[model samples]
Target chain A: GQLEQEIAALNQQIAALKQRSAALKWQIQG
Target chain B: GQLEQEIAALNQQIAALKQRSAALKWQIQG
Candidate 1:
């Protein structure tokens, strides 16, 4: 399981805007 | 941030080569 803190950092580096985490989550678990 | 190791790879793979060595190690250590 990805840690919350690390996920947060990845999101920022990925320059994920709105629904960015959603997209990644979908890619991982969708 | 993606850290020094992985970031260096992604940075090269995506764009900006010559910025890494082997596994994308920043020789300058900057």
Candidate 2:
């Protein structure tokens, strides 16, 4: 149960990090 | 120019890290 929740939290962070990565790429392109 | 290169490097690291994070989550799910 705790491990499941940890996985969920990590997924959230991964999503946010992907978005951040995209934004950084855009800035580099600019 | 160098800043752009650094940002690009960071983006690559973020992508790789995100992949690793997802793999960890998958293992946790299992």
Measured by lDDT, the strongest candidate is 2
Q: For residues B1-30, what per-residue lDDT tens digits would candidate 1 score against the true structure?
A: 555565456544434322222233444365
Please report the candidate that would top DockQ against the real structure. Answer: 2
lDDT of each model, Cα atoms only?
0.46, 0.76
Q: Candidate 1 residues A1-30, lDDT tens each?
A: 566665465545545332444464487575
TM-score of chain A of 1: 0.41
Candidate 1 ranges with C-alpha deviation above 4 Å: A16-30, B1-30
Please give, for residues A1-30, the per-residue lDDT of candidate 2 as tens digits: 997797687778667777887787697589
Best by TM-score: 2
- Candidate by candidate, in order, the iRMS in Å equals 9.4, 2.2
Candidate 2 residue-wise lDDT, B1-30, digit = tens: 998787777778677767877687688768
